[PDB]
C-alpha cells in the first residue's frame, strides 16, 4: 500500500466519467474544510495486516496534526503494483472501518472506479505533505 | 525519473521554510491559470536519456491537451530511490531546458529545496491525471 498524506486548508471532489466499467461506490461529490486528504493507492498482495498499519499510522498522524477530518481518496497512481479493482475496493472499505476504530473525526471515502475532478488547498508545513508504504 | 501530470484550471504555490540546508533556488510564489502541473521526482541514475524522454513526453502530452503552460514542479514523494539533491536539482534544470525545445509555452519551474503550500483545481476528464517512469 501506498499512500500521500496532504495536509489541507479545504478539499472538495466531483465524480465524473467512470473509470471502470462498473464502479463499485455510487457517484458523488463532497466538499470539506482543514483535513487530511489521504491518497490511496492499493497494492498487490495488501491485507488485513498492511491495513491495521495504515490505519494506525493515518490516526497518529492525524492526531499530531490535530485535525478531525479524513479523508480516503482512492488514487491509482502512487504503485506499479496495483492490486485488482475488486480487491483495492475490499481494502479501502477495510481501511475506513478500521481508522474509524482507532480516529473520532469524520472519516469520508472517496467514491471507487471513477475519474474525479478535484480542488485542494494544501499547507506548506513541513509535515503537510508525506508519503508512506505498507506491506506484509 | 518519476512524473505525476495534472492537468488543472489554476495552480499556485509559495515556498515556505526550507527543505534543505541551503536550497539552491532563491525563495518565491506564483499563481496560474489553465496548465499542465507536472510533479517531478528525480531518482538515483536518472540521466540525459531520461531527461530527454520526460521533456519529449511532457510536450506531446501538453499539445494533447492544448494547454499552453507547463509547470515543472520538484516533488520528494514519488519514488523511494530519490536521486541526491545536488543530481535531483541539476536534472530538473535540464529538463526544463530540454522541455523549451520542444513545447513552445510557458515553462516555469518551481523552486528546488523549499517546503511549499500550493493549491491545485485538477480537471475530472480521463487524461486529466496520468503518472509516468522514465529510465535509462
Ligand atoms: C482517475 C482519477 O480521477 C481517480 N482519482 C482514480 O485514480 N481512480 C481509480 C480508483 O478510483 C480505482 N482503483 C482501481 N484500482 C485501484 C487501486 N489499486 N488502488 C486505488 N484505487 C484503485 O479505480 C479508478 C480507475 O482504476
Ligand atoms: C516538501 C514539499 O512542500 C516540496 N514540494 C518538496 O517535495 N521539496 C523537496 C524538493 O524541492 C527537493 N528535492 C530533493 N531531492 C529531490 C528529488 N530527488 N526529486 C525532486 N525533488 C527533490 O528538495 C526538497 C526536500 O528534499
Redesign the interface.
Known sequence: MRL?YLHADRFEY????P?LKNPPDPPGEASFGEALVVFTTVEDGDGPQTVMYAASDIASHSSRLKVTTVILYPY???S?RLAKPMAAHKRLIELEGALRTKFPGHVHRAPFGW????????????L????R?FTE
Open positions: 500521500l466531483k465524480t465524473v466519467k473509470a491509482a497512481h502512487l506499479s475519474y474525479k475532478s478535484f480542488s485542494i488547498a494544501c499547507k506548506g508545513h513541513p503537510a505533505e508525506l508519503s508504504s
